[PDB]
Design a protein around this ligand. Structure first.
Ligand SMILES: O=C(c1c(F)cccc1F)N1CCCC1
Ligand SMILES: O=C(c1c(F)cccc1F)N1CCCC1
Ligand SMILES: O=C(c1c(F)cccc1F)N1CCCC1
Ligand SMILES: O=C(c1c(F)cccc1F)N1CCCC1
Lengths: 268, 269
């Protein structure tokens, strides 16, 4: 991978691996999400930011401040097949004192056509107290020189799927997958659960008949709380309708919410 | 990746990814195992085999026969760091009518030194009845032209740790991780649990203090029964021992039917 000619975005090519594909011989949404996360790491390394998923500066490290994902939105038109090369382009943009946004464009290396796109909202948080805070001007100026100055949105449409309010699922849920625990392969280098695992856990409550006859087109996921290594999760789904679903991840014991989201599927 | 000059082995280079590393900022043993599996797929594709992990010929497809892993053995000297390029070389060899063997050599692309090695035993099985069978001569002659004729072993040693008999763990186990279920990310393109998942499940019963102070040097794993998508697994570990050795057992949570048995060796960091 490498920064583009203007140094305001990053591109990387990936060959789809054998263990990265689902039952339709194409990459899973979790493989796509892992690749967006990997290209985001390489963009942060290529410009001197901390490489560990938190994209910190020496100022943030001193203050014990990290960037955390608050929302992930992904739309896939064509899943790359096993052996195919996918080219992902990523860039960041400041959203004032609210936080940062990271966008992605997925393309077929052979045809050059857009096969998918993603957007994510990141917030500043103290790693110890887990207390969110507004972005300070000392921090803003450190990353602004690596962002395009004019708006560059992967999802430009005025009021679109990526910025909608997600409601809380009402009990009883139509579908559920209970007793979900993370293993060591689900943890990152800092022993925290990888944000791609939450996507897999959300999709675990989608019935197999939907997976066998439909393809996932859109997924929006809000991150409210983190799941610890020794926590147990319950995944809940209800049909709100193409097939649309409302999702909810909550701790198995007290029922504390960790995630909420929506998925949209198309008939194959 | 590509077949070597003689067409009797395959090489491929991989860059270690950010989500592929553990707490030490180096590749996990499951990432290594996934890469050996990927280079094995590409070797099978480069010479005309099925590619779905079963390495089948038109003869094997007609008879509903597949190749399945019976044993996996891995020894790692240095785990590649995040960003490092690892070069893996793989080849196959016939073991008479017992089955096939697939071997691997892991090297650092910059230094050219051997950082790891693996060996695996594969058996012929009917897809439907799940009944093992000896390798027929019609099948042998279809893959023998893609194998070295003289023996080429990743583990040559006269007395080596890849061919030892593994005993069955006695209850009560010293350690255990109970209620392990596979999710959709644990399944392959044919909806079966990926062989690498069993390795992760075995390591789940190893206490965190061992993982934090030791590095995994050797892992031997026997595959006895497959875990279905809706099965639940219990992982059991007991210390058999500067080095730490463990005896492992994977069994179904209900009836206690054995699915895997193995051994791990760890050295102090
Ligand atoms: O400060 C950055 C960042 C950037 F603004 C440009 C390039 C690389 C970076 F890590 N980020 C905040 C969270 C999302 C990424
Ligand atoms: O505490 C978290 C969080 C995390 F810090 C890591 C993983 C998942 C999480 F929900 N958040 C609150 C603000 C949005 C993210
Ligand atoms: O028949 C093969 C094979 C081979 F013998 C040479 C090259 C590629 C192959 F898939 N195998 C069966 C078990 C796994 C390897
Ligand atoms: O029943 C299995 C098996 C399988 F066929 C697929 C996956 C895991 C398994 F333990 N075996 C019998 C001896 C060789 C492996």
């Amino acid at each position: 991978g490498s920064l583009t000619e203007d140094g305001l975005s990053y591109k990387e090519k990936f060959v789809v691996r054998s263990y990265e594909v689902g039952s339709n011989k194409t990459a899973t949404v979790e493989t796509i999400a892992n690749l967006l996360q990997e290209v985001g790491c390489n963009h942060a390394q290529s410009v001197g930011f901390s490489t560990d998923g938190f994209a910190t500066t020496t100022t943030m490290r001193k203050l014990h401040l990290i960037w955390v994902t608050a929302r992930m939105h992904i739309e896939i038109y064509k899943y790359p097949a096993w052996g195919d090369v996918v080219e992902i382009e990523t860039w960041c943009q400041s959203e004032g004192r609210i936080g940062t946004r990271r966008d992605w464009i997925l393309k077929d290396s052979v045809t050059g056509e857009v096969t998918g796109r993603a957007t994510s909202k990141w917030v500043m948080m103290n790693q110890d107290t887990r207390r969110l805070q507004k972005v300070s001007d000392d921090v803003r100026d450190e990353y602004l020189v690596f962002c395009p100055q004019e708006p560059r949105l992967a999802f430009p449409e005025e009021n679109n799927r990526s910025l909608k309010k997600i409601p809380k699922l009402e009990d009883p849920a139509q579908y559920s997958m209970i007793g979900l625990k993370p293993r060591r392969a689900d943890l990152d280098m800092n022993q925290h659960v990888n944000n791609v695992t939450y996507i897999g856990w959300v999709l675990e409550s989608i019935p197999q008949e939907i997976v066998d006859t439909h393809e996932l087109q859109v997924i929006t996921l809000d991150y409210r709380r983190e799941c610890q290594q020794d926590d147990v999760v319950d995944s809940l789904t209800t049909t709100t309708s193409d097939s649309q679903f409302l999702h909810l991840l909550r701790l198995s014991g007290d029922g504390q919410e960790i995630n909420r989201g929506t998925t949209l599927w198309r008939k194959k």
